[PDB]
Amino acid sequence: VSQLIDEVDRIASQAEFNKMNLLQGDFARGSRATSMWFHIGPNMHQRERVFIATMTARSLNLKGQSGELLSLSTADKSNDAIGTLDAALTRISKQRANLGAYFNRLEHAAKG
Amino acid sequence: GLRQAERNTEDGMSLIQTTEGFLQESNDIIQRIRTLAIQSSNGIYTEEDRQMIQVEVSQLIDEVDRIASQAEFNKMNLLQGDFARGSRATSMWFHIGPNMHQRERVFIATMT
């Protein structure tokens, strides 16, 4: 589990498109870091925002803010751990649905 | 006057074609939303799945109003409603004759 969690952290920290990190949360809703803005349109103010939420291991609750990874060393704490990665899977699926909606909208915009 | 009127009616044909092409993608988006609604009425889905599909629905209406407020032929908006039947803003005519009053009017309703 520790190896897998480290892999998730590495994926979040290293994934990028054009030397811009995406899953770290720089383009998230409540972020002062930066804001994504496409320019689908031939005039001055035809821009649209794109929101990508932070996908690190703290966001998915796979590790505490103190750095303690989600532990399954005992049966009792392994049983209640299932809710944690259930919430993580819900977050991942919601973000994937958001990205798919953005994809569909952009495809329609390009076709038009 | 006859030559200029032929040029003007060709320009009007271009405008009509542009407007219809703009309406095509909005029609397709509405059909997509209808398919989503039909596939959403089944009771097997939970609240989270319906929220996820509502994300795509929200994106699709956002796209629809984007086309409505961004469609433009000659630096003039068409689908906003400036040429509707009860257009309080302006009216547009297609001078298709070589004489003083040989003209016609075309209506473009609101599509927001």
From TrEMBL, chain A:
One of its GO terms (molecular function) is structural molecule activity. One of its GO terms (cellular component) is periplasmic flagellum. Keywords: Bacterial flagellum, Cell projection, Cilium, Flagellum, Periplasm. It is found in: Periplasmic flagellum; Periplasm. Component of the core of the flagella. Belongs to the bacterial flagellin family. This is Flagellin. The chain holds residues 114 to 225 of 281 of the full protein.
